[PDB]
């Protein structure tokens, strides 16, 4: 009985040690990859909208 009591005591001590060392945190870092070629082309702005201002009104005169 006494052996059981001491064994439970030390087992509870080591279990408490495990629980206290269990809560150590972990960290995530973000790694950024470049866009794939097809996705890039699908995302690319049409020239009709990139530089449409070339015929907007003019530069020597206002609107």
């Amino acid at each position: 009985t006494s052996f059981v009591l001491m064994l439970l005591f030390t087992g509870i001590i080591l279990i408490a040690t495990n629980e206290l060392t269990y809560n150590r945190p972990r960290e995530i870092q973000y790694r950024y990859l470049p866009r794939d070629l097809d996705s890039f082309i699908r995302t690319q702005e049409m020239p009709s909208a990139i530089f449409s201002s070339m015929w907007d009104v003019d530069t020597r005169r206002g609107g």
Binding site: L37, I41, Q44, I50, F51, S53, M54, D58, R60
Partner: protein
């Protein structure tokens, strides 16, 4: 076959040239552009 023979006979030496293509040569990219106008005029010369 023409261009298909060349296109198909692919090897390891090509992986470094065409694997995971990053660019397309047949569809270009235009940089942001601002509208400009040019005028050419005379300046006054001070002196003889």
């Amino acid at each position: 076959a023409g261009g298909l023979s060349q296109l198909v006979a692919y090897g390891a030496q090509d992986v470094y040239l065409t694997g995971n293509p990053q660019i397309t040569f047949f569809k270009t990219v235009y940089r942001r552009y601002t509208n400009f106008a040019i005028e050419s005029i005379q300046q006054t010369i001070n002196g003889s």
